[PDB]
Design a protein around this ligand. Structure first.
Ligand code: PLP
Ligand code: PLP
Lengths: 180, 711, 711
C-alpha cells in the first residue's frame, strides 16, 4: 500500500497545473522522418471525446462551440500522417479540417481565412485522486478485517501486538492526511 | 620509401668518388639522398624518418657503434656497409638481426651497384608485408581481368560522366583498382578462409598471442553480436556487465536469454570503478539464478575490461575464481596489452590456456590503431568453433567483403611486430608520463588554481598504478587490493570544484565549459561532464599533438583570471544565442553553473541512482517482440513509476546505461528517477548545456518523456 | 576536369588575339587547351571526353547548331560563348537547359577572364555534387580536428613505421583523410539521420523515383535481412520465391516464420523463367495455408525481379492481383529500370503509391554501377513505420560507418541525373542490340556452326521483347502473355548442342569448354553450364569490352575447325594434368563430354528435379537451433532417403537452390536425388570439370557426403 499511496501524492501535485485550461501534446519516441505526435495517457480514455476551443471560427459556413474527435482515428493521423476527419457540434459526418501542429504543442485549427484556434479539453480534491484513493483505502480495511479476527490466538506473544498494530495504524494515519 | 643515408667522410678520394658516382645513379630510379653528420645524426634519421631503407657507411670506422643501436630499432633495415681489405666481424655481432651488403670502391661500376640496391629494397618490401597485402598490390599492376565486380572496375565507369570524374580524381588510380570482390583466385576468399586469407588469421593470432584471430569487416559492434549468438542458446543465462555498450544492448534484445547484471564500484566524480572480487565467487554466480525466475546455469560471462575510461582489471584472479566456461573481455580500448612488460597477466591473452574455459576478446581496430573504419578482431585462447561458426559470421557480413579494410586490419598487426613497432607502445607511455609530470609541475609553481590528474602521489615508476585501499586519490570506498589498475596513457584531468572527501566546494569550474573551449583550437574531448576530462594518447598522438594540449590548458587560466567576455573567447557559443550571451563574462557563467550543482545536489543523486538496480520484470528479448506488434505507449516523467521501459537510458553525463529495456521503477529504485528529474531543471536555464539523454526526448516545455509498454 | 575547348576560327585578328592571350593565362591554373575542327569535332569531345567543362565558340556563327546538340548531352555544361554587337537569342532557345557566359574581345583583360572561368568551374563542381560528397571533399582541405576516430587520423600513424609508409603511399593523402567516423559535427551521423545525411536520403529517393531511400554499408546481403525482420513477426507467414539467393536462405533461418515456396517456370537449356500468374491468385495462396501446418495469412511476399539470368516481370498485374501488404522486389540486377521509356511500369518504383500496400527493393550498388563494395539501398514506396524498420538497420550496421562507401553510393545516384546519365543506360542498350545483330550476321554468312543469341527472330525494335505464347525461341511450355519480358543488355549466348524441341544432337559443344577459353584472354564468364552463357553489359562496359568479346568468339571457331591441341590453346588446363591432357586435341575433348550428357541424360533429369518440391517437415528456423546443440551428422549420398538436411544444396550448374535446410526427400521427390548422383559420375573422369555443389563435401573415394540431422 505504500508503493501506491506515494504515487497518489506525486499525482496530486501534477494535476494542480492541469485542472486557463490547455492541452499539451507530447511527442512519441522513436526515429521517424516526420515529427509525429502522441495523445494523452491516463488523462483521456474515452473513444468519442469532445474538445473545446477559445476563439470560435466559421467552419463549413456555420458556427461551432465544440469539436469531437475519434480516439481510433487520432492515433493514426498523428503517426502515419494524412488527413484528419472530424464532425462538428457532435452531429453530422466526420468532415475534413485543416488541423496542424503548434510550436507550443497545441492543436491549431485553420479555416478559410488562415486563423488560429487552440483546442482544449473540457474540465470537471480532483476526481481522479479521490477515485484512486478510495480503492487503496478499501484494501486497508480488508487486510485489517482479517487481523481483527485471528488476534485471539493463544500461541502468539503479547509483545508483538504492539508492533503489528502500530504498523497498520501508521499507514491509516498517512492515507487520511492527503484527503483533508 | 626511397631515402638513402651516406654517413661519415673518410677524407680520401678513392672512397668519396664512388659516393659521387652513386649519387647520380640512384636519382635515376627515384631515390632521395641525405648526408648526416656525426653518429647521433644518423640515429635521428630512423626514429623520426620511417621512409629510410639504405645506410651507407665505412665498415672500418664504426663497426660496433652503428651495428648495435640500429638493430635495437629496425632489424630488417638493410645496411650498405662498404668493407675494405683488412676487414672482419666481431664476437659481439652474432646475436643481432642485421642485413649487411658488402661492396667495393670500383670506378665505373656504379651502375651495377644501383641495380643491386633497387633489388635489395624490393626484397625488404616483399618481407615486411603480409601475403594478403602483397597479393593486393601485385593484382593492381598485373591483374587486369575483364567482366568482374564491381561495375566501375578500377574507375572506368567514372571516366564516362563529368560528375564521375571528380570522384575518381580525388582518391587515385591505385585506390579504385584495390576494391575487388571474391571473384579472384590468386587472392582467396574471406568467406571460405583459404589461400591468402587462411595465412592472414594465423599471422595476427601469432603476433597478438592468440589461437585464431578473425577479421570482422563491420566494426566492433558487429563482432559483439556474432559471439553473443554462440555461447547463449535460446533459453539460457549470461553474465553481462552493467557498464555495457549500445551494441551489447541489441544483443540481449535478439536472443531469448536471461542476463544477470552486476554492481561495479563507483565514486562521486562519475568514473566507474570495476566489478568487486565478491561477484566472482561460487557463492555469487548461483546466488542470483535461483532468485530470478526462469534462469539456468550461466554459460557465458561478459566483463567490460577495460571500461570506457581505461581501468584494467585482474585476469589472474578471474580466470581461477569465476567458474564460467565462456568469459568475455570487452577489450575494445586496449589493443596493445602484449607489446610491453608492464601488461603481463593483466589481459585475457596474457598467460596460458585455461583448462575447460575460453577467453573471448573483441579488440577494436579503427579506434586506437591504424586502419580503415568498420574493422574488428576476435581473439581466441583455447578451443572454439569455425566450421559451423562461419555460418553465423556470414549472416552479418556480405558475400563481397571490402579488401581495403582487410588489408589495413592485418597491417595493424604487422606495424606492431618487432622492435620497430614496440617503440610506439613504449613511446606513447613515456609521452603520457611526461604529460602527467608537467601538470604537477605547473600546479605548485603557478599562482592560483590549476588542473589535476587522477593519479597517485608517486608516479616515478613506469608501470600500471594499482588501486590500493590506503589511498585517497581514487576515492573508491571499500576496494579490493591488487584488482584495479590504471592506464598510463589514459590521463584523466580533474577540474577543481570538489573536495577529496566527496562533498562540494565553493570555487570551481565545471568540465562542460572547458570541453567546448578545446574545440575552438581543434581538440575534441573524449568524455566530459561533472569534473573530469578523458583523452586518448595512443600511437596517433605524436609529440606535436601532445604538447599542443597543455598550451590550450594554460590559455584557459589566463582568459579566466583576466575576466574576459564570452564573445571574445567562445565564438561558437555566442552564435547560439547572441541576445542572452551579450553582457556575460567568463567568470559570471562559471559561478552560476557551479551554484546549480550544489543546489540540485549532483554527486548524491548520481551515486545513489546508478548503484541500485531496478526490478527487471521480463527479459530484454520479450520487450522487442512487443514493439514489432505496435503496442508502445508513453507517459509523463512523473507518471513512469511502475511501468516497464523499452529503451536504454544513457544520460550524458555520465556515459553508462541507467535503466535496461524491460525493467520497472518502484520504491527500491526511487533515486534512479530522481537523477532524471534533476537533469531536466539544471539543463534548461542556460542555452548550450541542454540535457542529453539517449531516451528522454525533448518536447517544447521542459519535461521529458520516455517510451514504455502498454498495460 | 580541366579541358577547355575553343571551336572554329573567324580568320580575323581582333577575335583570335584574345584567344592567344587567354591560351597563356589558362595554363597557369592547370587547364588543358584543345582546338577542335568543325561542328562534328566538338561533339566527339563530350561523349568520349567527360573531363570537359569549357566550350569557347563564336555566338554569331553557330547559334543554333551548337545550343541544341550540347543541350541533349549535358544541362549544366558551361558555354563560354563570345558574343558581338549585333547578337541576340532565338525563339527555339527557351526550353533548353544551358549555361552561357558572355564575354568581349578586349585586350589586356585576359587575366580577369581567367579568374572568371576558374570561379565558374568551381560553381559547376559545387552544383553537380551532392551535399554529402561535397562536404567530404571540403573537410579534407579545411577540417583538421584532433583526438578523433579512427586512430590513423588521416594517415598519421602510418608515417612513423617503415611498413606503414608503403601502405600510405599506395592510396593517397586524400584517401586516408576521407575515412572519418561520426566524430564530425558539420557532417552529421548516419545512424542519427540528420544534417547532410538527411538530405542525402531524400536526394537518392527523388532521383530514383521513391519516397525514402537508405544507404546500406554492408552490401545487398544485409539489406535483404533487414526487410525480412520487419513484416514478419515471430510466428507469421512469408511468400518467398524459389529462385532465392544465399543471403535469403539465412533470413529464413533467423526468424521463426513459415515460408511458402512458389513454382517458377523453366525450359530445357536451364534459363530460369518466372512465376505464373496463377500463383498470385487468392484461391491459390489460401489453398497452401491449410495444407501447410502452422501457417496463417501471409503478410509478406518476396519476388526475385529480376532473376539471375535477366527476365523482368509485370508489376502492373502483380500490384493488383497479389493481395500482400508487403511485396518485395529483389532488384539486385536491374539498377536502371527508370531512366528509359522502355522500362515504364516494369519495376516497383515505376508508377504511383498503392494504397494498403508497400514495395520494398534492395537494389545492388556495387554490382552494375560504379561505387565501392559493401553498398546497397532500400527503396520504400508507401506509408510505413520508420521507428520500427530502423531498429533492424542499426543492429546490422556499426555505429561508425565508412563514409568512403557512402560517398560513392550517393555518387551513383548523381551520375544518372540529366542527359549525361540518360546516355549511359541507352548507350549500353544500343551497344547490346548491335552485338546481338553481329551474331546473326556472322551466323548465316559463316561456313559451319556458330553461336546463337537467345532472342526472338525480330530484334529490329528497341524495347523489351515480350515472351509470347506463339514463339519457339523461349521454349517455355504454357507461358503467360504480357508477363515475362526480355532484358536487352543481358545477352544469353546459346551454344550449338540441342534442338528446338528440347532433345539432344550428335554434334554439340558444351558451354563449359568455351568458358575456359574466354578466361585465357581475361574474359570472366558470369554464368555457364550446359549450353548457355551470360554476360553483364552495364554502364561501365564501353565499346572496347563489347567488341573484344566477339573477337574471342571467332577465334574459338578457327581453333576448333583446324583441330588444334589442348596445350597449344588452353595453357591453364594443361598445367592441371599434363600427363592426361598430352595427346588430347580440342575435337576429342569436345566430343567425349557431349556423349556423357546424352548418356546420363542431363536435360530430362534437371527439368524433373526442380518442379517437384521436396516435402518440408519443419521450418528453416528450427533446423538452425538443432545445429548449435550438436545434433548434426553426415551421411552418404546413396543413403539419405527420409532424412532432414541441414545445409542448402546449390549445384553448379545451374545456380538455384535444390533442397532447403529443413526438407525431407521422400518417394515424391525421387528425381531430385537422381540429379545429385548424376553430377557425381559425369564430373569425375576428366580433370578440370569436377562437380561443384555447395554443401557436398568431397571425400577420398569420390562419393559426396551431405550433412543431415540426427534422429
Ligand atoms: C566504440 C565502442 C564500440 C563501437 O566500435 P565500432 O568499431 O565503431 O563498432 C563497441 N564497443 C565498445 C565497448 C566501444 O567503446
Ligand atoms: C550478388 C547478389 C547478392 C549479394 O550482393 P552483395 O551486394 O555483395 O551483398 C544478393 N542477392 C542477390 C540476388 C545477388 O545476385
Amino acid at each position: 500500500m505504500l508503493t501506491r499511496l506515494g504515487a497518489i501524492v506525486q499525482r496530486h501535485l501534477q494535476l494542480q497545473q492541469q485542472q486557463k485550461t490547455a492541452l499539451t501534446v507530447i511527442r512519441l519516441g522513436g526515429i521517424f522522418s516526420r515529427r509525429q505526435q502522441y495523445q494523452l495517457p491516463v488523462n483521456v480514455t474515452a473513444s468519442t471525446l469532445t474538445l473545446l476551443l477559445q476563439k470560435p471560427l466559421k467552419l463549413h459556413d456555420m458556427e461551432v462551440v465544440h469539436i469531437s474527435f475519434e480516439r481510433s482515428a487520432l492515433e493514426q493521423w498523428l503517426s502515419k500522417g494524412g488527413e484528419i476527419r472530424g464532425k462538428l457540434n457532435g452531429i453530422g459526418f466526420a468532415q475534413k479540417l485543416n488541423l496542424e501542429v503548434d510550436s507550443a504543442q497545441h492543436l491549431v485549427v485553420r479555416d478559410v481565412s488562415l486563423q488560429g484556434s487552440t483546442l482544449a479539453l473540457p474540465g470537471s480534491l480532483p476526481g481522479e485522486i479521490k477515485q484512486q484513493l478510495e480503492e487503496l483505502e478499501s484494501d486497508w480495511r480488508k487486510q485489517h478485517a482479517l487481523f481483527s479476527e485471528q488476534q485471539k490466538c493463544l500461541f502468539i506473544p503479547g509483545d508483538w501486538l504492539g508492533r503489528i498494530e502500530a504498523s497498520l495504524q501508521d499507514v491509516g494515519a498517512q492515507i487520511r492526511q492527503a484527503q483533508q | 620509401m626511397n631515402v638513402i643515408a651516406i654517413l661519415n667522410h673518410m677524407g680520401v678520394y678513392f672512397k668519396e668518388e664512388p659516393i659521387r658516382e652513386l649519387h647520380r645513379a640512384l636519382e635515376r630510379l627515384n631515390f632521395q639522398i641525405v648526408y648526416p653528420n656525426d653518429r647521433d645524426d644518423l640515429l635521428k634519421l630512423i626514429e623520426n624518418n620511417a621512409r629510410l631503407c639504405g645506410v651507407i657507411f665505412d665498415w672500418d670506422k664504426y663497426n660496433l657503434e652503428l651495428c648495435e643501436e640500429i638493430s635495437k630499432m629496425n632489424e630488417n633495415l638493410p645496411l650498405y656497409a662498404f668493407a675494405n681489405t683488412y676487414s672482419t666481424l666481431d664476437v659481439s655481432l652474432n646475436d643481432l638481426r642485421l642485413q649487411i651488403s658488402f661492396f667495393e670502391y670500383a670506378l665505373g661500376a656504379a651502375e651495377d651497384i644501383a641495380n643491386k640496391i633497387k633489388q635489395t629494397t624490393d626484397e625488404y618490401i616483399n618481407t615486411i608485408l603480409p601475403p594478403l597485402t602483397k597479393a593486393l598490390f601485385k593484382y593492381v599492376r598485373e591483374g587486369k581481368y575483364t567482366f568482374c565486380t564491381p561495375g566501375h572496375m578500377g574507375g572506368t565507369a567514372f571516366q564516362k560522366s563529368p560528375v564521375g570524374s571528380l570522384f575518381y580524381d580525388f582518391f587515385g588510380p591505385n585506390t579504385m583498382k584495390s576494391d575487388i570482390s571474391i571473384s579472384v583466385s590468386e587472392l582467396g576468399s574471406l568467406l571460405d578462409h583459404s589461400g591468402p586469407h587462411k595465412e592472414a588469421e594465423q599471422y595476427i593470432a601469432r603476433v597478438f598471442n592468440a589461437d585464431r584471430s578473425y577479421m570482422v569487416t563491420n566494426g566492433t559492434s558487429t563482432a559483439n553480436k556474432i559471439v553473443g549468438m554462440y555461447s547463449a542458446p535460446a533459453g539460457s543465462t549470461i553474465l553481462i556487465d552493467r557498464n555495457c555498450h549500445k551494441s551489447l544492448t541489441h544483443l540481449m534484445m535478439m536472443s531469448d536469454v536471461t542476463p544477470i547484471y552486476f554492481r561495479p564500484t563507483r565514486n562521486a566524480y562519475g568514473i566507474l570503478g570495476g566489478i568487486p572480487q565478491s561477484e566472482f565467487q561460487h557463492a555469487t554466480i548461483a546466488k542470483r539464478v535461483k532468485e530470478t525466475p526462469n534462469a539456468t546455469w550461466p554459460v557465458h560471462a561478459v566483463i567490460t575490461n577495460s571500461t570506457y575510461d581505461g581501468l584494467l582489471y585482474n585476469t589472474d584472479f578471474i580466470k581461477k575464481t569465476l567458474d564460467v566456461k565462456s568469459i568475455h573481455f570487452d577489450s575494445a580500448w586496449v589493443p596493445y596489452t602484449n607489446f610491453s612488460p608492464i601488461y603481463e597477466g593483466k589481459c585475457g591473452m596474457s598467460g596460458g590456456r585455461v583448462e575447460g574455459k575460453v577467453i573471448y576478446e573483441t579488440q577494436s581496430t579503427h579506434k586506437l590503431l591504424a586502419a580503415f573504419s568498420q574493422a574488428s578482431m576476435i581473439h581466441v585462447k583455447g578451443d572454439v568453433n569455425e566450421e559451423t561458426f562461419n555460418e553465423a559470421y556470414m549472416m552479418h557480413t556480405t558475400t563481397s567483403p571490402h579488401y581495403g579494410i582487410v588489408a589495413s586490419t592485418e597491417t595493424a598487426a604487422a606495424m606492431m611486430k618487432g622492435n620497430a613497432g614496440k617503440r610506439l607502445i613504449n613511446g606513447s607511455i613515456e609521452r603520457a608520463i611526461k604529460f602527467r609530470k608537467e601538470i604537477k609541475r605547473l600546479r605548485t609553481e603557478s599562482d592560483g588554481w590549476f588542473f589535476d590528474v587522477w593519479q597517485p602521489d608517486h608516479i616515478d615508476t613506469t608501470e600500471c598504478w594499482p588501486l590500493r585501499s590506503d589511498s585517497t586519490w581514487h576515492g573508491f570506498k571499500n576496494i579490493d587490493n591488487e584488482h584495479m589498475y590504471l592506464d598510463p596513457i589514459k590521463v584523466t584531468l580533474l577540474t577543481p570544484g570538489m573536495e577529496k572527501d566527496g562533498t562540494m566546494s565553493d570555487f570551481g569550474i565545471p568540465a562542460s565549459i572547458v570541453a567546448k573551449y578545446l574545440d575552438e583550437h581543434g581538440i575534441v574531448v573524449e568524455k566530459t561532464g561533472p569534473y573530469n576530462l578523458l583523452f586518448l594518447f595512443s600511437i596517433g598522438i605524436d609529440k606535436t599533438k601532445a604538447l599542443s594540449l597543455l598550451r590550450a590548458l594554460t590559455d584557459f587560466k589566463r582568459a579566466f583570471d583576466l575576466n574576459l567576455r564570452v564573445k571574445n573567447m567562445l565564438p561558437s557559443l555566442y552564435r547560439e544565442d547572441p541576445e542572452f550571451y551579450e553582457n556575460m563574462r567568463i567568470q559570471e557563467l562559471a559561478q552560476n553553473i557551479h551554484k546549480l550543482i550544489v543546489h540540485h545536489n549532483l554527486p548524491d543523486l548520481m551515486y545513489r541512482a546508478f548503484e541500485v538496480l531496478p526490478t527487471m520484470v521480463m527479459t530484454p528479448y520479450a520487450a522487442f517482440q512487443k514493439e514489432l506488434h505496435g503496442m508502445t505507449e508513453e507517459v509523463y516523467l512523473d507518471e513512469m513509476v511502475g511501468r516497464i521501459n523499452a529503451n536504454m537510458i544513457l544520460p550524458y553525463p555520465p556515459g553508462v546505461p541507467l535503466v535496461m529495456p524491460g525493467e520497472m521503477i518502484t520504491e527500491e529504485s526511487r533515486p534512479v528517477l530522481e537523477f532524471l528529474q534533476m537533469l531536466c531543471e539544471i539543463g534548461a536555464h542556460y542555452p548550450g548545456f541542454e540535457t542529453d539523454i539517449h531516451g528522454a526526448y525533448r518536447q517544447a516545455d521542459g519535461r521529458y518523456t520516455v517510451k514504455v509498454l502498454k498495460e
